[PDB]
Write a protein that binds this DNA or RNA. Structure first.
Ligand SMILES: Nc1ncnc2c1ncn2[C@@H]1O[C@H](COP(=O)(O)OP(=O)(O)NP(=O)(O)O)[C@@H](O)[C@H]1O
Ligand SMILES: Nc1ncnc2c1ncn2[C@@H]1O[C@H](COP(=O)(O)OP(=O)(O)NP(=O)(O)O)[C@@H](O)[C@H]1O
Ligand SMILES: Nc1ncnc2c1ncn2[C@@H]1O[C@H](COP(=O)(O)OP(=O)(O)NP(=O)(O)O)[C@@H](O)[C@H]1O
Ligand SMILES: Nc1ncnc2c1ncn2[C@@H]1O[C@H](COP(=O)(O)OP(=O)(O)NP(=O)(O)O)[C@@H](O)[C@H]1O
Ligand SMILES: [Zn+2]
Ligand SMILES: [Zn+2]
Lengths: 619, 619
DNA sequence: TACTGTTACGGCTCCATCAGATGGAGCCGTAACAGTA
DNA sequence: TACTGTTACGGCTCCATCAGATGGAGCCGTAACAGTA
């Protein structure tokens, strides 16, 4: 009737104990980097999967989850966790249809293109329209029909089998994954969903919530990690972590029904839910000053030759259902054209007639939708580009000049100035042939990543390792005088990473922390007073407080005289905009035209847009 | 609250529907080859495992269970099914201790025998008696300690790591497997145990029942297939199949509590439980006539130089705990010595001083404990040796003489007289690269396994395929005149296989059917009136009716003037014996001496033997 | 003289055990060139 | 003349995809030899 976890100390958990009810819809909420993903994925899912698969084949197991740093878990059950630009990965590989087709052509084929090029619906119709062949391929046909039906019911029936999954839209891919993993008709299995509401419109989120409720009604336990109010308002239990983030959080703050979290004063999530902390709605929207940017005849992806006008110098939001061509309209055409015109980028734009008003701008800055790449040779200091300035600082010291050390001698990724015993990693690489790997600190350099000769050179009494092993808040005061490093550190501090260290490995970063690192890196660049900001889904993996910080900095940038366009599905960002362009009304071939356009109130008055009705309800 | 199976037609199931309660101890009983193993293992376990692992890695899945021929299963949960003389398989490989030791020696070893040669207890004591080594091998040590503790608690703490698992006793190996598979502390998992009471004494069965009840109290479902009264008397639900075996059974006869099965008149299991059908206890035991067989100074395995005397010409049973040296005393010494003395076998006997009374015998016949080997090129006719006589019959026909066909032309395992299209298999070998294989009948020979030229030659109006595709009951009348084939078929009929066909592939045979085939093959040999029968666990995988048939034929053989020794743990066989030799009192190094010896009443009067107390309670 | 026991050899089949490689992209570091203020 | 945008190349690391081999034993078929009645 419960899952009792005792002595949970994985990552940043401060030896906490929880009692997660069974056969219930329970969410895990908190700040970015607070401990939700650790507590759920790295402990409960890991223990359940390991315990189940330990009673299985050893070779198959080698081809499981590592043991968490926990004392004991009671009431555990087998766990399934739903939770890349790869050219060699298409719809057929993900849905396994391509494997079935290859096997069928190898077995009963008579010595392909018409099936791969055909859509899901066309292929299903063709399949539905000597008995030895049927006897041989009865199971293949049954599996093909089941997979096609699941994909059609997932809301992505317009896709083609030969299309690459790297270019696949977030909503369609997420729906396909949910249909594949949820459709098993099992009972007594704990399901863990790590942020299952990314790249999904409100209607898609509602359909996913209905599907999850149906799955839970079978007699399962739903443990989802969510940041959206819609998900947390449709659950019977909430486990709130915190009270802060990073080393300042990792313990349970509040627990219970959403009303209990609302009444709880120690929970930031409850305060943001009730309304004690809220994003202020602008009383007076910024009216356009006559400066407009027009694109005529969009013909990229599912574009139906539409005309849209985006004002310059105001807050602009792009809305619509998943697959409605928001990215195709904004990124692939506008960003590429602006980059080619201004930054002299050698990139080919999308299919369009022409764009007016380009001369009104002077610079373009963009944040795409792809996540960042994780590597142990990177940290926030290297990612944001401030590490080069810090290395120049350390090479500008009198000791560095006297000893001849160059600017590249203070980096662990370049030989000649790093601990050669650990190859600059800082820890050894002891690995197990058939067991999860372990981390052992390197005793030659004691984890400082630099040898004695490098650490001898000190700037203001601190060597490179000390400044790498200290947080952004301290670096704000340490580098106050010098303007460039101060600006970069101030951007990192304002984006919300005032607790993280400058040398934390990116592989250990959370999704929200990496997202905020990317946002700070892109927004730390110089603005000339007339700049075009194109943000594509910036509030992903971000709590409402981080969303508030991002909205504040974006509005400060807008007030500085620049223009901002945000492709966001979040109502908090949408309600603060001054001009909303809506696309749709359906994903795929069913949409690609402007359902509505205007100020948020005008779009809300529109009775056709789903976003219009959602905005009317919100306002 | 239930598992609903509809349209179950795997193997010999006649499209039946069952409602198996959840979170209960439910057994599946019936005759040998009735449908228990199919219904449980091939349907419920298969569907549960496939449904769980379909939401897992594709490559790992290739390195699952085939889809059963069922309509739908409701209320399913992930399923774990507990259910060879391999020199390259020891205790370390089964318990995975050897892999851990090899990994530890590769990682922290300083550039083995003392650990492999040491027992489990010695190794545990040694392990329990720079911190970098402990940090590196903390998980390895924890896993080693957990496995050693589980093995010790399983009741097999005296074993050595270097000992081969092929020579491992049944009780110790079964206890180790149960400890390994049961110790996972999971909840909501269906456990399927296929005959978990083979090679186990009554005390070991009781300890296993206690362990299974403890495991079920966690909130799991126990679906065991059992033939022993002790297991079926400790369950809250019984699903009895039948009413016959083979093609005469496969449907549900009775279901409910053991009292309901007792009161049910249509169930054979209930009739045997209540006492309507029972094995008659001999009123007057066969007293020895002075003929005795003495072995002095046994020194094989855990033998403590004991003296035992086995009478000649009476029913003798060997009892004792698992590992008490029953096989070591009887088989390895007596059978080898008798074979070398009489049959001129070139085998080396065990370590003993000498054996008296060998000249009193004239022949030795034995049935060992190892199961039979499964191959698609064998059937009961080939296994029992009657196929050679049938082929000689078919080569003795006038058509065979006229056409020149030899005795080997009527076998599907020899080229030149078989369907070369299917290579004598009778079906094609269509295989899937990553899917379960399928069977397609060969259209060249229509499944008759023989070409037109071979099928032209007919004996008494029937060709070889027709006589191969007909049951033993028909073959009893067909071959009535000829004495050798009549004797072999009569042995096969009396052993209980009056429904099976003469050409059924052994790979499709059940455990009880293969066991009875082996018993018939060994007991069909000629007896000279003074023969020594050494049966080692003959009533394994056999229902009480098959046990009754075997007891009847054994007692007829004894009354014919021969001697029989049975190494059996079954009380039904034991209570009908005339002289019981008990070994023990503990398995492994803790036993190897005669706890008691005498008639069943005298051994029952003994207050030290566990078998004595069990016999006293039974009588 | 035939039936029955053994061994011996050739060919076919099942089962437990051992214990990854590759192409694509993303990131860090350095170099080079051009526009602007 | 310095700051900031781009491209271009070498080296390091993560992730999805492809889609078994071997030694041991057991069984069928045939041959060969020996004991017994
Ligand atoms: N190996 C590690 N050592 C120390 N801290 C770590 C380690 N790995 C992760 N952390 C930190 O632990 C905190 C919790 O991370 P995690 O639990 O994965 O994220 P989360 O709370 O689900 N947040 P987010 O994904 O951003 O919504 C973060 O501040 C991480 O930087
Ligand atoms: N390379 C491509 N070629 C053809 N069609 C594509 C391609 N990439 C995406 N599409 C389709 O174009 C439509 C719009 O996709 P896109 O505009 O990228 O999504 P989006 O609006 O950002 N939606 P989402 O990411 O879910 O919020 C969808 O039906 C996609 O499947
Ligand atoms: N492929 C098949 N086609 C037809 N009959 C089959 C096939 N496989 C197995 N059988 C028969 O189906 C019957 C049920 O076998 P099975 O269910 O495996 O045994 P069981 O009832 O558990 N008995 P046992 O193991 O002897 O205690 C037996 O008579 C088998 O010979
Ligand atoms: N080859 C061997 N070398 C040494 N010890 C052995 C060997 N085979 C078995 N043993 C041990 O000798 C003891 C008796 O085994 P054995 O007499 O073969 O079993 P059993 O009496 O038939 N018991 P069971 O089969 O469970 O009913 C056990 O402790 C075995 O582990
Ligand atoms: Zn080092
Ligand atoms: Zn054929």
């Amino acid at each position: 009737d419960y899952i009792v976890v005792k002595g949970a100390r994985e990552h940043n958990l401060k030896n906490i104990d929880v009692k997660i009810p069974r056969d219930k819809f329970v969410v895990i909420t908190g700040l970015s980097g607070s401990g939700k993903s650790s507590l759920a994925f790295d402990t409960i899912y890991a223990e359940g999967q390991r315990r189940y698969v330990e009673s299985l084949s050893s070779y198959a197991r080698q081809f499981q989850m590592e043991k968490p740093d926990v004392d004991y878990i009671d009431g555990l059950s087998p766990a399934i966790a739903i939770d890349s630009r790869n050219p060699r990965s298409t719809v057929g590989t993900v849905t396994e249809i391509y494997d079935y087709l290859r096997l069928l052509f190898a077995r009963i084929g008579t010595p392909i293109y018409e099936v791969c090029c055909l859509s899901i619906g066309e292929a299903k119709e063709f399949f539905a329209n000597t008995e030895r062949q049927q006897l041989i391929a009865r199971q293949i046909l049954k599996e093909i029909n089941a997979r096609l039906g699941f994909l059609v019911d997932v809301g992505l029936d317009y896709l083609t089998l030969a299309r690459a999954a790297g270019t696949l839209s977030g909503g369609e891919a997420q729906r396909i994954r949910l249909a594949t993993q949820i459709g098993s008709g099992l009972m007594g299995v704990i399901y863990i969903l790590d942020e299952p509401s990314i790249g999904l419109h409100q209607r898609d989120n509602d359909r996913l919530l209905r599907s999850l409720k149906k799955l839970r009604d079978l007699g399962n336990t739903l443990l989802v990690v969510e940041h959206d109010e819609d998900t947390m308002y449709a659950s019977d239990y909430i486990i709130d972590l915190g009270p802060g983030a990073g080393s300042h959080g990792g313990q349970i703050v509040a627990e219970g029904t959403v009303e209990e979290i609302k009444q709880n004063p120690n929970s930031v999530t409850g305060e943001y839910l009730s309304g004690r902390k809220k994003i202020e709605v602008p009383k007076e929207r910024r009216k356009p000053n006559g400066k407009w940017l027009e694109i005529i005849g969009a013909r990229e992806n599912n574009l139906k030759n539409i005309n849209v006008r985006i004002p310059l110098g105001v807050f602009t939001c792009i809305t619509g259902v998943s697959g409605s061509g928001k990215s195709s309209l904004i990124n692939e055409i506008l960003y590429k054209r602006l980059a080619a015109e201004l930054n002299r980028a050698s990139v080919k734009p999308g299919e369009h007639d022409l764009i007016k008003g380009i001369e009104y701008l002077d610079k373009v800055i963009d944040i795409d939708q792809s996540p960042i790449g994780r590597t142990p040779r990177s940290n926030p200091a290297t990612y944001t580009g401030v590490f080069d300035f810090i290395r120049e600082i350390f090479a500008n010291t009198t000791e560095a000049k006297t000893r001849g050390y160059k600017a590249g001698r203070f980096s662990f990724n370049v030989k000649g100035g790093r601990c050669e015993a650990c190859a600059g990693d800082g820890i050894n690489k002891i690995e197990m042939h058939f067991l999860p790997d372990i981390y052992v600190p390197c005793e030659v350099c004691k984890g400082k990543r630099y040898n004695r000769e490098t650490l001898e050179v000190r700037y203001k009494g601190k060597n490179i390792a000390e400044v790498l092993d200290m947080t952004v808040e301290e670096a704000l005061e340490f580098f106050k005088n010098i303007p460039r490093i101060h600006k970069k550190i101030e951007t990192l501090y304002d984006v919300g990473l005032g607790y993280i260290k400058l040398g934390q490995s990116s592989t250990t970063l959370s999704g929200g922390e990496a997202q905020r690192v990317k946002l700070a890196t892109e927004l730390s660049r110089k603005s000339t007073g007339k700049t075009m900001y194109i943000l594509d889904e910036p509030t992903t993996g971000l709590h409402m407080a981080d969303v508030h910080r991002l909205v504040g900095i974006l509005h400060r940038l807008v007030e500085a005289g620049n223009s901002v366009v945000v492709i966001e599905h979040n109502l908090d960002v949408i309600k603060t905009a001054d001009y909303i362009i809506d696309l749709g009304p359906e994903g795929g071939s069913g949409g690609g035209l402007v359902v509505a356009e205007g100020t948020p109130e005008e779009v809300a008055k529109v009775e056709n847009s789903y976003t219009g009705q959602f905005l009317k309800k919100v306002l």
